[PDB]
């Protein structure tokens, strides 16, 4: 039993997977088995969701997070996001679940049966962490794989049914994307936008053409980069900048994933384009705005002139100006005026909310949608009692946006922590003092006193 | 035809359970690795076969 | 809901998503079996 106790490996049971660092075969096993776990949860969770799915209830009333992902891709839904066929959901689930058996098979094999190290077995599959060439090569392979994936999204959107477009004219609907945005000024334009209010960085992408074009770009960039890293070896400045070891690479990737997790948190919290509110429920901004809309509609029906109605503070009760002058909803929701949504935009004119449009053009479907979203705001308790913290039990509801945002903030945080841990440790190990200070060569003892 | 379907699917589940317990046990077993290896090949082929059969019969019962 | 044909497996389906968690616990059973060496 090679390297399977503390005495031989140097690592205690609670750090047992650190025993895998230079055992490429077994490590391969661990990774493929884990991928199996991921695919397994995807499939199993999908089937669970589908079994619990009532098609005439909003998805977001039913604690669903995966079926919304499938539906956003255009599968299973029609106008307004109505479920017209559940079978694609079923397929996605079954196929992931079946595939996880294969992955788990390979993982268990490599982990407890196959060659424990791959280097003597295969120069192709074997690797030394310090071998910068090989590392950048494998990196290259996987970049090519990622590019291929992004291109699969593109292909779905352009040649295999399209995507669900919440902004589709005449109402949300599945639409084939035929003119993706290829202009780099726009695409990387998103990348250079402020992350702050009314800007939102890449989180602000608000049309499917930009999404698709972005994935075209990312696909080509990843394939090119992958080839590049297969064909080259790190330059000198890179060599001198980084730590070259398994734990170092792990630390780098942990940092990356922490960042991505934070980004995704914000994405699901603010964006209603790639996270359609039809499937995920309204965003926080959206529901607050919807309340303002709802009572403007009610009171105006009662005879109120909502344009001239002065609220208690002196600001408009229903309508006021943003700090740059646009007409926006009043009350606390003044904070959310950057919100944009298919149900509200028809009331928007060049200077913001249009009083004439508000007075004459509000449709019943808009009233409905505003009421729905106001009454499904992403607020709720840990035991899924919907509403403000003082609400009585009755409605079983926590928004999927809340579940996704909170989960991925937690995970992103702990992954930042993991990055600090493994980066600091990789530094110390590479320099050779990860196990402690050499008593006979204590560095501070050779330094001049501070005073 | 439905009888065939539920047969094949029940078989798939059972075989799956059997493999789930038996493959790691076999892999980590000192003795009888030859026959075990044979049986893992057999069970794998039969597993793939059953998935394909359930997959096809799906469209003749749903 | 699942297609009618599969409905008999509803209980099984209800239990599947939790299986990954079991693997975590299995790691500990296994370690206890080798005395956490």
């Amino acid at each position: 039993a090679t390297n399977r106790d503390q005495e031989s490996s140097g690592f205690a049971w609670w750090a047992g997977n650190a025993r895998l660092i230079n055992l490429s075969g077994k490590l391969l096993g661990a990774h493929v088995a884990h991928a199996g776990l991921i695919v397994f949860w995807a499939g199993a969770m999908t089937l669970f969701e589908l079994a619990h799915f009532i098609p005439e209830k909003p998805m977001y009333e039913q604690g669903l997070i995966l079926i919304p992902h499938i539906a956003t891709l255009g599968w299973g839904v029609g106008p307004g996001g109505e479920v017209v066929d559940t079978f694609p959901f079923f397929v996605v689930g079954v196929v992931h679940l079946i595939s996880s058996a294969v992955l788990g098979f390979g993982g268990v094999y490599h982990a407890i049966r196959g060659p424990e190290t791959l280097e003597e077995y295969s120069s192709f599959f074997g690797y030394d962490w310090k071998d910068k060439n090989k590392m950048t090569t494998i990196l290259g392979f996987h970049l090519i794989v990622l590019g291929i994936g992004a291109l699969l999204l593109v292909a779905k959107a352009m040649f295999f049914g399209g995507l669900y477009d919440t902004w589709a004219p005449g109402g949300g609907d599945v639409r084939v994307i035929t003119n993706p945005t290829l202009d780099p000024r726009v695409i990387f334009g998103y990348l250079l936008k402020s992350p702050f209010g009314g800007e939102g960085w890449i989180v602000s992408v608000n049309n499917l053409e930009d999404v698709v074009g972005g994935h075209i770009w990312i696909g080509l960039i990843c394939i090119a980069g992958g080839i590049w890293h297969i064909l080259t070896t790190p330059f000198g400045w890179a060599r001198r900048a980084f730590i070259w070891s398994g734990e170092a690479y792990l630390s780098y990737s942990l940092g990356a994933l922490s960042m991505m997790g934070f980004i995704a948190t914000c994405f699901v919290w603010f964006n209603n384009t790639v996270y359609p509110s039809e499937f995920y429920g309204p965003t926080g901004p959206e529901a607050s705005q919807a309340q303002a809309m709802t009572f403007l509609i009610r009171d105006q029906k009662l005879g109120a002139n909502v344009g001239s109605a002065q609220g208690p503070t002196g600001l408009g009760k229903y309508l006021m100006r943003s700090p740059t002058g646009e007409i926006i909803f009043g009350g606390e929701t003044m904070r959310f005026w950057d919100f944009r949504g298919p149900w509200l935009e028809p009331l928007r004119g060049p200077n913001g909310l249009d009083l004439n449009k508000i007075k004459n053009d509000i449709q019943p479907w808009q009233e409905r949608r505003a009421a729905e979203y106001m009454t499904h705001a992403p607020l709720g308790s840990l035991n899924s009692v919907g509403g403000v913290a003082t609400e009585i039990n009755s409605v079983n509801f926590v928004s999927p946006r809340s579940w996704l945002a909170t989960s991925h903030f937690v995970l992103a945080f702990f992954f930042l922590v993991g990055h600090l841990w493994h980066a600091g440790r990789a530094r110390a190990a590479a320099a050779g003092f990860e196990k402690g200070i050499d008593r006979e060569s204590e560095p501070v003892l050779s330094m001049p006193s501070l005073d | 035809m439905t009888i065939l379907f539920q047969l094949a699917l029940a078989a798939l589940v059972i075989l799956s359970f059997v493999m789930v317990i038996g493959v790691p046990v076999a892999y980590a077993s000192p003795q009888d690795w030859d026959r075990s290896k044979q049986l893992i090949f057999l069970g794998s082929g039969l597993w793939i076969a059953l998935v394909l059969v359930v997959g096809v019969l799906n469209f003749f019962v749903v | 809901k699942l297609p009618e044909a599969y409905a008999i497996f509803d209980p099984l389906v209800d239990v599947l998503p939790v299986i990954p968690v079991l693997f975590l616990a299995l790691a500990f059973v296994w370690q206890a079996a080798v005395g956490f060496r």
Binding site: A1, I112 | F17, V20, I21, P24, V25, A28, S29, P30, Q31 | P11, L12, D14, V15, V18, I19, L22, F23, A25, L26, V29, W30, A33, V34
Partner: peptide, 29 residues
């Protein structure tokens, strides 16, 4: 509601069962 508990009992035992079988057969744990 019986079948859910039966199933999770079978799966839930399936794990420890592997360990036990291997421990008995003095396998490569």
């Amino acid at each position: 509601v019986i079948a859910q508990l039966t199933m999770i009992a079978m799966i839930g035992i399936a794990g420890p069962m592997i360990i036990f079988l291997l421990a008995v057969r003095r396998g490569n744990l």
